Structures are given as C-alpha cells and as structure tokens.
Design a protein around this ligand. Structure first.
Ligand SMILES: COC(=O)[C@H](C[C@H](Cc1ccccc1)NC(=O)c1csc([C@@H](C[C@H](C(C)C)N(C)C(=O)[C@@H](NC(=O)[C@H]2CCCCN2C)C(C)C)OC(C)=O)n1)NC(=O)OCc1ccccc1
Ligand SMILES: Nc1nc2c(ncn2[C@@H]2O[C@H](COP(=O)(O)OP(=O)(O)OP(=O)(O)O)[C@@H](O)[C@H]2O)c(=O)[nH]1
Ligand SMILES: Nc1ncnc2c1ncn2[C@@H]1O[C@H](COP(=O)(O)OP(=O)(O)CP(=O)(O)O)[C@@H](O)[C@H]1O
Ligand SMILES: Nc1nc2c(ncn2[C@@H]2O[C@H](COP(=O)(O)OP(=O)(O)O)[C@@H](O)[C@H]2O)c(=O)[nH]1
Ligand SMILES: [Ca+2]
Ligand SMILES: [Mg+2]
Ligand SMILES: [Mg+2]
Ligand SMILES: [Mg+2]
Lengths: 54, 431, 439, 346
C-alpha cells in the first residue's frame, strides 16, 4: 500500500512498502571455567595412573 | 598424518595380523619389498596411517610382532610378505605360554613386555600425530590372551590419551579342544572391558559355522577361518585407510559407536561371503549387499541380532555403485526393522561408500554393529567358565603361577555385570 | 567505509568459506591471483568491495578472512587450491588433532591450545581496519570444532571487541550428510553458549539444501560441493548489501535493527528463488510475481518449517537482476490476498526491499543456470522454532539414558552443562511460542 | 509394509482404523515414540507437527490438519466468521454470536448494543452460553454466569423457533461427518444422524435443559422418555427423509442437505490457504463433525465443528473403512460404490 524511503543509485534501488501499521562474561570468568575443566581432566587422569600403578 | 601402531601377539594374533598386512598391502599397491606399484593416488593419500616411509620411497608397516615362542614368527618371515616387516620389530621369547593366561600376563610375559614397549616407544616417537594402537590376538591361548592384555594396560599407562583398538578372536570348542580356554577368555574380557576403546569380537564359533554351513567346507582349516578374518579386517579399517568423511579415525569411530564406556564390543559382518581361492563371477546388487550384511548368517560373532537391539551401526560399502541406491537400501533396512534399533539414539546407523573394491570382488559391504545381542557370546563363555570354576577344575595351572581364586571370581563377576549391562539397554525405551 | 572480517571454523565453515570467496571474486571481477583490473585506486580505496577485501601495494585484493580448523586436511586444500595466491599464510590456521565431533574437545581440550593464536591472527586483520564493523562467523552446529571452538571464540570476541557486531552462518545438522550421532548435543551446547554473543544468525538446514539440490537441480545424491555452491548464493545475497552500493543493510548493525527486535529471537529464515538446473536447456524465465511468491513456499526455504503457523516480526526482500519497484509492489499486493502472512501486533505489516541490478553470478561448471532475476527473502518468523523443537527432542532422547555423555565428561565437562544448555533451549522455545501463538 | 503409530488411545474412531489396518496384513503398528512411521494417528492436543516430515525415505501422513482448531474451538469459529472476508456478513447461516471474556480483544460492549435493540424492538431475545450451558433472556443472568465460570465463553442467539419432529414435538441436531484428504478433497459421509430430544419442546421454561439441549450424554442421564421414539435418540437419514416426505412434502436432499453442503464447503474452503499441506514436507487428513440446527422454515444453521468427532455405533464399520480407503490407502496403496459425496470446489 504505502511506499516509503525510496533510494535510487547506479547499482540498484531500495525502499520499504508498508501494508498496515502496528496495533557478558569477563576474560577471568572464561579462563576460570576453562581451567576448572582442565583440572577435572587432570584429576581423572591422575586417578587412572593411580589405578594402573596398583 | 594420524598414524596407527599395529601389534600382533601369539599364534592367532600373528597369523591374522600377517593376513591383514598381505591384504591391505595389495589394496595399497605395495609389494613384498615395500615398493609402490599401484595405479591410483587414492592408494597413497593416507598410506602413513599404517606405513612408515623410508629411503627410496619404501613403505614399512608400523607393525610390531610379539610372541613368547619363535615358531609363528619364523613362519611369518618365511611367508610371502615376511620380508616387508622391520626386522628390529620382531620381539620374541623361547619358552611359550602353554595356553596359560597367568604365564602370558604375570610370569613369562612380564619378562618380554619391556622389550616390546621399547619397540612401541620407537614407533610412537616417529609419529607426526599418533592416533592409537590396534592389537590382533586370541583370548583362548596364553600369549595373545595374557600378554596381549598386559601390553594393552602397559601401553595405556604411557599413552593414556590414545585410542586402543583390538581384533580379539573369541574361542569355541568347534575349533579348539583346549579345556582351559574359557578361563583365559574370561580373564582377558575383564581386561578389555576396562582398557580398550573398541574391540571387534571375532568369534571362532561364527567363523567355523560360516565355513561349514554357508561356504560348504566340510573340513575347514585355520586358513579358511582367517580368510573371513582378513576380509573383515580390510572392511572395518577401510575408513581409516582411504579418503572419506565418516569414521576416518579411531576416535571419531569410538565417538559414533560407543555410547557407554564398557559397551565397546562390536559384532563385525561381511557380504558377500567367499571361499578361499573361489572366484565370484556375478557381482552383488546394492539390495543384496544390504540384506546380507545385516543377516545373522553373515556375522563374525555367533549372536542373533534379532535377539537384541542395535545401539549403533556403521556400514561400509566398497566398489562402483549408485550412492542413491545405498542411501535408499540403508533407509529401507532401518525403516522395515525399526524395532531392532534403540529409539533413544536417533540416526544411529552411519554409512560410508569407498570407490576402491577389495581384491577379487567388484562390490562388497562390511558391517560393524554395537548390538546388545553380543551378550549371547559372553553368556556362552560364562557358562563354560562356571562349569569348571564351580569345581575349581584346572586351577592349579594358574595358582601355580602365583594367581589366586579371587581373580577368577572377579573376572567372572565383571563379565556377568557386562551381560546384565547389555540387557539393561536392550530393555530401555524412549519412555 | 567500515570493514567486515569473516571467520571460517571447522570443515563446514572452511569449505563454505571457499565457495563464498570464489563467488565474491567472480562478482567483483577479482582474478584468482587477487588482481582486480577494474580497480583504479592501487594499494587502497574505500569502495564498497573494500568492506570484504583489503589491498596490497601490488594491487592484490586480499579477503578480510581467517580460516581456522583443528585439522590440517581441509585448509591444506585452500593453501594449494585455485585461490591459494589470494590469502596470506597467516590467515590459514590449523592444528594436528581435531575435536572428534565432541563439543568438549573443541571448546576445552584442543580449542584452548589454539584460541590465543587465532585471536592474535584476527587482531592483525582488525588493525588494518580504519573502522571495523564486526564479524561473520561460518561454522557447523554438528562438528566438534564448528560447535565447541566457535562458542569459545564468540565468547573471546565479545571480550576483545565489545562494540563490534557478530553474525553467524550456522550449518544445522541433517542425517542425510551428518557424520556423528552426537550432533544434537553439540548443536544444543553451542547454541546455548553462543546465544548472548551473537547479534544475528542465519541457520542453514542441510536437509533443506539437500532436498533443493535433488528436487530443483536434479542431483541424484548431492555432495558438499553441490550443497556449498547453493549455500554460497544465499550467503552472497545476504552480504551483497555490504559489498555493493545501496541503502538497505549497508552495515551489520542494520541487520539486527531490520531483522531482530527481540535479542534472543535472532534467527531469520532465508528463502531463495529461483534455483534452476544448468542441464535444463530451455527454462521459462520466471517473473517478479513468480519468484516473490516462491519465497512463501517451504520447499524453497533454508530451514524446512511452516511460517503460516507462526508470526512475523520483520520481513525483508533482497532482489538481484532485472527488477523495478513497481513489479515488487504489485507482487506483494497479489501475495497478501492469497497467502497467510500474520505479523506480531507490535510490528507493522510490511517489507523492506532492496534491489541490485546485477543478476546472480554463477560459478562456471556449476549446477545453477544463469537467471535474469533472483530474490532472497529474510523473514524473522516464529516458525523457525520448529528447528529447535526437532533438535531438542533428539537431545532429550539420548540425554535420558546419558548416551555418549561420558565422552564429554572425560574432556572436563559436567552433566550440569548439558541440563543448563537444555533449560536455555526450553526457555528459547517458550519465548518463540509466547510471541507467535494465542491459545 | 507400511508403518503407523497410535498416540490417542481414547479415540474410538481411530481405535477402529488401527484395528482395520492391521487386519489388512500390509500395515504394522510401531511403539508410539518410534519416529520411523508412514502414518500418525496423533494426540488431541500439543500434536508435534514440527517433528513430522523430516524422516528420509518415508512419506509421512497425519490424521489432523494443523490450524483446524480455528474452525473447531467455539470462540475461534465466531472470530473466523466475523473477521474472514470470505465468510463475511453475507453469512446468513451462523447464529448471531459474540466472544465474551470474564471480567478478570473482547466483544462484550457490542453484545449489549445489539441486545438492547432486540429489547425495545419487541423481537425474541433468548440467548445461550458456550452441561456447562445456560439459556436465558436476561443479559444480566448470562453475563454473571460467565464471570463465575472463569473460562472464555460465547453468547449465541438461541434458535427460538426450531423445527419440531412429530409425533413428540421434539428439538434435534444433525451431525454430519466430513473427511478432508491430503489433496483437500472434501468428502461428506452420506450417512448422518439426528441427535433428538426425547421430551417435547417447552417454549416457556428454559431451566429444564433436557428438552432444549439435544446432546446424547444429557439425554441418557436426565431424559425421562429416552429411546421411546427411536433407538438411542438417533434417527437416521432413511427415516428422516421419509418423515419430511410424508409431513412436509419435501426431501432431505432439497430442504436441508443443499444448505449443509454449502456451509461445509464455505467453512473448509475459507481456511484452506492456512491449513492445506499441498506442498508441505508432510501431508494431513482429518475427520470433522459439523453440527446443525434446522429452523421451522427448513433453514439450516451451523452450531459447531468438532475436530475429534466420534461416530454413531451403527456407522463406525462403514465410515472407518472409508477413512482407510479414501484418506490412508490413497497415499499408501495396498496390493490388489462410494460412501462419500465429494463436495466440488476450485
Ligand atoms: C600347506 O598348508 C596350507 O596351505 C595351510 C597352512 C595353514 C597355516 C596356519 C594358519 C593358522 C594357524 C596355524 C597354521 N594351516 C592351517 O590352516 C591349519 C593347520 S591345523 C588346521 C586345522 C584347524 C581345525 C579347526 C576345526 C579350524 N582343526 C583343529 C581340526 O580340524 C582338527 N580337529 C579338531 O580339533 C576336532 C577333533 C574332534 C573334536 C573337536 N575338534 C575341534 C584336526 C586337524 C584333527 O584344520 C585342518 C583341516 O587341519 N588348519 N593348511 C594346512 O596346513 O592345513 C592343514 C591340513 C589340512 C588338510 C589336510 C592336512 C593338513
Ligand atoms: N553444507 C555443508 N555441511 C558440511 C560441510 N562439511 C561438513 N558439514 C556438516 O557439518 C557437520 C559436521 O561438522 P564438521 O564441520 O565436519 O566438523 P568440524 O567443524 O571440522 O569439527 P571436528 O572435525 O569434530 O574437529 C555435519 O552436519 C556435516 O554434514 C560442508 O562443506 N558443507
Ligand atoms: N443457538 C442455539 N439454538 C438452539 N439450540 C442450541 C443452540 N446452541 C446449542 N443448542 C443445543 O445445545 C446442544 C449443545 O450445543 P453445542 O453443540 O454447542 O454443545 P457441545 O459442543 O458441548 C456438544 P457437541 O460438540 O458433541 O455437539 C446442541 O446439540 C443443540 O441441541
Ligand atoms: N581364527 C583363528 N583362530 C586361531 C588361530 N590360531 C589359533 N587360534 C585360536 O586361538 C586360541 C589359541 O590361542 P593361540 O593364539 O594359539 O595361543 P598363543 O600363541 O599363546 O596366543 C584357540 O581358540 C585357537 O582356536 C588362527 O590362525 N585363526
Ligand atoms: Ca582500490
Ligand atoms: Mg602357540
Ligand atoms: Mg573436522
Ligand atoms: Mg463440542
């Protein structure tokens, strides 16, 4: 129905056609999480080597 | 690249290991000297997975040959491809293991294990990025069974972040009359449950029944049984040896196949089944390869898939065929047999197609299934074990080597827990 | 002129990145060696194509891009490919051991070892920018690198470039080309982790692309080469407004302004028509009415779903070729009286249209025929939440039995991360339903 | 072999359809959450339409049309008649209705504007709300009832001069069964039922709801003369056409079915662009139950549409085979004249 904001140029053109109107974490927090995961991997591996040593 | 280190232990391990190298060396156009004489670059694209390069473009298997007896390793040197293996990689003892697991794992094997580990370290050092290890062995004897599982545990101690894959030949009275094999096999399955990532259950019961019933071989030899093993080993390692998308390394295979850590024993399968020396003149159609590979008669583990449920499956088609037709037939199998696939693991069957067929066949398909029906195999070993253990029969052979009854009781309990765990997931439902 | 840095993570991101840069080169007239004869300002300039290409003193037009993968194989084919001379070695980054289709390996174990090297290489591109706009991140939801490494990188990019926009081109998993059983886990873990860090994301269901290749291009069993060429045409339609003269979607912030009113509901649905076979000798050239109407067909959508059973928050039409505004308004008028197109009460029922007179460029030896006009509709519809429901249900089936969870826990992840991610997806599904439904 | 899932155990109609499909030797019932099915006989509410159509190598069909709730919910049917330009105020077959919300968007003000026109106009003024029903001429009684119920109701003009069957002087409602297949062909089942009141129609006292509400449930419980005129208060079209011929010198076809067929077509054609699965990744089919009232001048009015209708005991065998033949086997053909009337439309 209503065509608005028409802009023409050599590459093309653009406009809006309206039919009806309406009715983060820190660097420290990232490293803390990443090293808590690495420590859990290390704990799991130490337990495996403790087990294999037995 | 991603290098695999292969280890073969005992008579069975070295026999099937030697046939593996003969088969894949032919597929990769490598002659017994270790020279390439092939026609396709796909043969050499991923050659460093199993072979080391050397002076004058020579390819040497990254294989380590182990035995507490010189016998079978003298036969491998005398064999066709024996000349291709690195001589310093032949580690062997003089007194055997006499089909005694305790000898291989605690006394005789304990002496030779450090020499093998030196060869393993040398092969692992020269790896750009080692992915893991693959052992070939049987579980009924003494060296492959006992020493093989000691090696698995000692390797896991030095390389805890690497994948451990095995081709374990499960014993059967149809092939062997050694009375103590159920003890050796139960003791090894206990080790495999805790220390391997992927184990292909190569059952001698299934290989014998395939030879006798299907291939009509009234008197099957070990060569006939091993002809099925080498065909299966070629098929299950195709994804590791050639360029491709699915299960291209041991870790991606484990992540797709193993949903629970202890449930890592696979039912291998192959289509078309072929007799050693027999030529196959009519190629199979894609619907035929598909029906046969999922059929109970084509399984290398003597279990009925219709008696359990598939947790995961990997299908590998080899040869020139319609990629649209394999997709249609794989969906056809899953949709017309949906009861046999766990509903709580969506899209659990993955398919790979490789253009290079194996020697002698224009088209083939290899199946790798993590089915709960594998408990039938462990129940069979467990019944045989309990029949003798119930009366402490033959135990002096093991207690004489320092072992106690409690190890047998614990090995017995751990396998019964493995069976009950496979049953738990068979009976589990999406609600 | 404000710059845009593209980042391609994992095999899917890298291979789709190749199809895109190859296509951008053909569209801008940049040769494989980086030389652009039509560019008369050597060594620099602030032209529209300079938002994606920097310039050396020797006249080489170098993509503002970084390719990262935890495996060498895929990026090695870029290092030795037809556009190998187009990129500096410092833009191509690889590891040795991949994430093995495991979000935890990509985010934690392997990813942690290469994250600083990647941010360093991204900062070298950012320092050549007089006014960095933000980033375009290409990755799969299913892969271990694509899911885990991307979410790690998106978190670090929020910290290092707080005022810079981040758009995504995410490959949503389809079993017809999937390579892992755990892809629902990786998809829900990455969606949860990246949600606060992404301003706008364009999901591409491989199933939808796969079916368009089979149905419209008559390809028996499409390969990633077939899928990626079709995907690159849709990506090119979306970035055309950043690389060419125009007024609609000239910068990255305009994408969130025009397509994303609610920050969490930042997944627009892309629909592209016409997709026609090159093998087809004779084809009736479609009209503006025909191609615009096809934007309301689920068969031409990048994510298969039903927008009639949902609501629109923002619709936007991107035309390429022989198109005049009179044709678009007539098409929209005839469509409104035929199709069911309901907008949320707090938004105006309307379309933002952009036209570029250059028709779509097709890579020679391709599957798509040359066409006189083509369109890409981007619509923020609440019906795209069907994609989340499907993936969340597969996650639920496996997580009930904890199937495969041990692989994640073994790399340092906790079971609580899985339920935390699933509660966020349950919240996201609920947000979509609140907005788009009445009963 | 075809495969199917059953997710509504309470559906009497689809319990027979599953019974019939298995009895053919070409269909297999899977566990309800098995996704590898060709046919879904889905749940009544929260049916997962988002999950249908994404299983490669399987044509998936479902027994419900997504978006048909607009026609089958009472408040939705009023909004659909009023706001659809296709149905319009050229809709002379739907009784005057208003969506009323409890005082806890709403057309409560316009109800009182039209009510006071009928008060001073001296014309009839009895209405009906949405067991759980109230018929009265006092607007205050009806509005105070809905506030106490708490749920959203509709105030419809009660048909004050209904057609009354003789002997008995009784009110009735016609239930028509309509099946719409995946190709949006509309099928009217030739057999219908008259759900009759067993007591004479009392024009004075509306609190005696048994002579005013012709539902089968209220009749078997509160009826005093149940089954005296016809078995189960169900008179079928063979008898009803004969009654009209003998008493009114007309036929069921001419006097009533032309109007019923017009209403069924108008209602379902209006929503076609919203619910049609013609180019969807999954196909839908659905059984509907249209309820009608006939006034004293043989004019048909639409009372409501039921999305999960139940059939008459006598007719389940015939209708359920037609669902299999027409809606299921048309998509999934079996190996090796019509109970329906195709309502033509373009
Ligand atoms: C020139 O020879 C060849 O080309 C062949 C050499 C291979 C090499 C090799 C491979 C792997 C391991 C060792 C050696 N040899 C064999 O294939 C081979 C050697 S023994 C053997 C044997 C195996 C049998 C089982 C069933 C597979 N087997 C043990 C038996 O058949 C014996 N019977 C039983 O054990 C029964 C007895 C009754 C109770 C139940 N038991 C299970 C039997 C040998 C007594 O198979 C055969 C047929 O010997 N395979 N092939 C070669 O040398 O074959 C040996 C051979 C075959 C035929 C005739 C003479 C010798
Ligand atoms: N469309 C498309 N999808 C792809 C492509 N490559 C992979 N995928 C999809 O991406 C998913 C797997 O992610 P990948 O990109 O291969 O994995 P990755 O990012 O490299 O991660 P890892 O290999 O686990 O380290 C599956 O859904 C594949 O189908 C590609 O080039 N195009
Ligand atoms: N406006 C009206 N005029 C006259 N009678 C009416 C009426 N509205 C309802 N009735 C009577 O009341 C009965 C119940 O109405 P309605 O059909 O809306 O209830 P319901 O939906 O709970 C039962 P069903 O869905 O099985 O038909 C009708 O069958 C009809 O006999
Ligand atoms: N399939 C197969 N089984 C074999 C072979 N050699 C031995 N076996 C089986 O392996 C078991 C004996 O183990 P073995 O490997 O001989 O003992 P080890 O040398 O002490 O490891 C029995 O079950 C044999 O039947 C062979 O080449 N092929
Ligand atoms: Ca310039
Ligand atoms: Mg021996
Ligand atoms: Mg990868
Ligand atoms: Mg009702």
């Amino acid at each position: 129905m209503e065509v608005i904001e028409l802009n023409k140029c050599t590459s093309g053109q653009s406009f809006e056609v309206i039919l009806k109107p309406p009715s983060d974490p820190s660097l420290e927090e990232i490293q803390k999480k990443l090293e808590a995961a690495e420590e859990r991997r290390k704990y799991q591996e130490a337990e495996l080597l403790k087990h294999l040593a037995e | 690249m991603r290098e695999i280190v292969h280890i073969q232990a005992g008579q069975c391990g070295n026999q099937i290991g030697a046939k593996f190298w003969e088969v894949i060396s032919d597929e990769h156009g490598i002659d017994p000297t270790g020279s390439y004489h092939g026609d396709s670059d796909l043969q050499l694209e991923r050659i460093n997975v199993y072979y080391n390069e050397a002076a004058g473009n020579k390819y040497v298997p990254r294989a380590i040959l182990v035995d507490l007896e010189p016998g079978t390793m003298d036969s491998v040197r005398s064999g066709p491809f024996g000349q291709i293996f690195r001589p310093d990689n032949f580690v062997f003892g003089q007194s055997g293991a006499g089909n005694n697991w305790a000898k291989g794992h605690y006394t005789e094997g304990a002496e030779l294990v450090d020499s093998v580990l030196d060869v393993v370290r040398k092969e692992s050092e020269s790896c750009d990025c080692l992915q893991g290890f693959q052992l070939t062995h049987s579980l009924g004897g003494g060296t492959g069974s006992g020493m093989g599982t000691l090696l698995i545990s000692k390797i896991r101690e030095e390389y805890p972040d690497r994948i451990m894959n095995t081709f374990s030949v499960v014993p059967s009275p149809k092939v062997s009359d050694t009375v103590v094999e159920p003890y050796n096999a139960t003791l090894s399955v206990h080790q495999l449950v805790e220390n391997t990532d992927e184990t292909y259950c190569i059952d001698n019961e299934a290989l014998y029944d395939i030879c006798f019933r299907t291939l009509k071989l009234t008197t099957p030899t070990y060569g006939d049984l091993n002809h099925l093993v080498s065909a299966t080993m070629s098929g299950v390692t195709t994804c590791l040896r050639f360029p491709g998308q699915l299960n291209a390394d041991l870790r991606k295979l484990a992540v797709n196949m193993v949903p629970f850590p202890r449930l890592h024993f696979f039912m291998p399968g192959f289509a078309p089944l072929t007799s050693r020396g027999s030529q196959q003149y009519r190629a199979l159609t894609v619907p035929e390869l598909t029906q046969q590979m999922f059929d109970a008669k084509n399984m290398m583990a003597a279990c009925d898939p219709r008696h359990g449920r598939y947790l995961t499956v990997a299908a590998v088609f080899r040869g020139r065929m319609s990629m649209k037709e394999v997709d249609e037939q794989m969906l056809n199998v899953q949709n017309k047999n949906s009861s046999y696939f766990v509903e709580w693991i969506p899209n659990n069957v993955k398919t790979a197609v490789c253009d290079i067929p194996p020697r002698g066949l224009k088209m083939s398909a290899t199946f790798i299934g993590n089915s709960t029906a594998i408990q039938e195999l462990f129940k069979r070993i467990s019944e045989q074990f309990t029949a003798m253990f119930r009366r402490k029969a033959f135990l002096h052979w093991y207690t004489g080597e320092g072992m106690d009854e409690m190890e047998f009781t614990e090995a017995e309990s751990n396998m019964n827990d493995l069976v009950s765990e496979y049953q738990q997931y068979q009976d589990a439902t999406a609600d | 002129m404000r710059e845009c840095i593209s980042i391609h993570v994992g095999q899917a991101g890298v291979q789709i990145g190749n199809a895109c840069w190859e296509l951008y080169c053909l569209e801008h007239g940049i040769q494989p060696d980086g030389q652009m004869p039509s560019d008369k300002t050597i060594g620099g300039g602030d032209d529209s194509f300079n938002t994606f290409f920097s310039e050396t003193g020797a006249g080489k037009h170098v993509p503002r891009a970084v390719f990262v993968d935890l495996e060498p194989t895929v990026i090695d084919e870029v290092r030795t490919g037809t556009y190998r001379q187009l990129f500096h070695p410092e833009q191509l980054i690889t590891g040795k051991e991949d994430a093995a289709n495991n979000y935890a390996r990509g985010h934690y174990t392997i990813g942690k070892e290469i994250i600083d090297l990647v941010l360093d290489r991204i900062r070298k591109l950012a320092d050549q920018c007089t006014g960095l706009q933000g980033f375009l991140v290409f990755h799969s939801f299913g892969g271990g690198t694509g899911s885990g490494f991307t979410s790690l990188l998106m978190e670090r990019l929020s910290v290092d470039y707080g005022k810079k926009s981040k758009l995504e081109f995410s490959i949503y998993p389809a079993p017809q080309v999937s390579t892992a059983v755990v892809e629902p886990y990786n998809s829900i873990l990455t969606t949860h982790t990246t949600l606060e860090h992404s301003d706008c994301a364009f999901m591409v269901d491989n199933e939808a692309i796969y079916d368009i290749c089979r149905r419209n291009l008559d390809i028996e069993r499409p390969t990633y080469t077939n899928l990626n060429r079709l995907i690159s045409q849709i990506v090119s339609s979306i970035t055309a407004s950043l690389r060419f003269d125009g007024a609609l979607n000239v910068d990255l912030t305009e994408f969130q302004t025009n397509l994303v009113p609610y920050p969490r509901i930042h997944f627009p649905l892309a629909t592209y028509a016409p997709v026609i076979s090159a093998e087809k000798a004779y084809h009736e050239q479609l009209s503006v009415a025909e191609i615009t109407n096809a934007c309301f067909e689920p068969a031409n959508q990048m994510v298969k779903c039903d927008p009639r059973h949902g609501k629109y928050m923002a619709c936007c039409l991107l035309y390429r070729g022989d198109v005049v505004p009179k044709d678009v308004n007539a098409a929209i008028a005839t469509i409104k009286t035929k199709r069911s197109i309901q907008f949320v009460d707090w938004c105006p029922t309307g379309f933002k249209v952009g036209i570029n007179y250059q028709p779509p460029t097709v890579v020679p030896g391709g599957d798509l025929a040359k066409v006189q006009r083509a369109v890409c509709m981007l619509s923020n519809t609440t019906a795209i939440a069907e994609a989340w429901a499907r993936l969340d249900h597969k996650f639920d089936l496996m997580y009930a039995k904890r199937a495969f969870v041990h692989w994640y826990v073994g790399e340092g992840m906790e079971e609580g991360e899985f339920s935390e991610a699933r509660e966020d997806m349950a919240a996201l599904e609920k947000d979509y339903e609140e907005v788009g439904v009445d009963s | 072999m075809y495969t199917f899932v059953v997710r509504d155990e309470n559906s009497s109609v689809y319990a027979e359809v599953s019974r019939l499909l298995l009895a053919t030797g070409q269909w297999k019932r899977l566990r309800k959450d098995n996704p590898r099915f060709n046919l879904m006989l889905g749940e009544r509410n929260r049916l997962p339409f988002g999950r249908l159509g994404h299983e490669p190598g399987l044509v998936q069909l479902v027994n419900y049309y997504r978006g048909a709730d607009k026609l089958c919910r009472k408040a939705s049917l009023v909004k659909l008649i009023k706001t659809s330009p296709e149905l319009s105020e050229s809709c002379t077959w739907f009784p005057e209705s208003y969506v009323i919300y409890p005082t806890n968007t709403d057309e409560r003000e316009v109800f009182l504007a039209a009510y006071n026109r009928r008060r001073e106009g001296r014309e009839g003024n009895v209405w009906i709300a949405k067991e759980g029903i109230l018929i009265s001429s006092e607007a205050s009684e009806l509005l105070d009832f809905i506030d106490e119920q708490g749920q959203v109701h509709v105030i419809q003009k009660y048909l004050e001069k209904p057609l009354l069957l003789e002997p008995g002087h009784r009110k009735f409602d016609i239930r028509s069964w309509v099946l719409v297949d995946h190709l949006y062909n509309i099928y009217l089942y030739r057999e219908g039922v008259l759900r009759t009141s067993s007591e004479p129609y009392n024009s004075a006292n509306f609190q005696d709801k048994t002579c005013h509400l012709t539902n089968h449930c209220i009749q078997k419980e509160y009826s005093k003369n149940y089954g005296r005129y016809e078995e189960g208060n169900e008179m079928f079209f063979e008898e009803f056409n004969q009654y009209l011929m003998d008493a009114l010198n007309t036929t069921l076809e001419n006097s009533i079915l032309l109007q019923i067929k017009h209403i069924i077509r108008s209602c379902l054609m209006c929503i076609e662009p919203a619910i049609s699965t013609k180019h969807l990744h999954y196909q839908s089919f659905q059984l509907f139950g249209f309820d009608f009232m006939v006034d004293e001048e043989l004019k048909v009015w639409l009372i409501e549409v039921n999305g999960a209708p139940a059939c008459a005991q006598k007719l389940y065998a015939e209708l359920c085979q037609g669902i299999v033949d027409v809606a299921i086997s048309s998509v999934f053909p079996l190996a090796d004249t019509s109970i329906f009337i195709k309502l033509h439309h373009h």
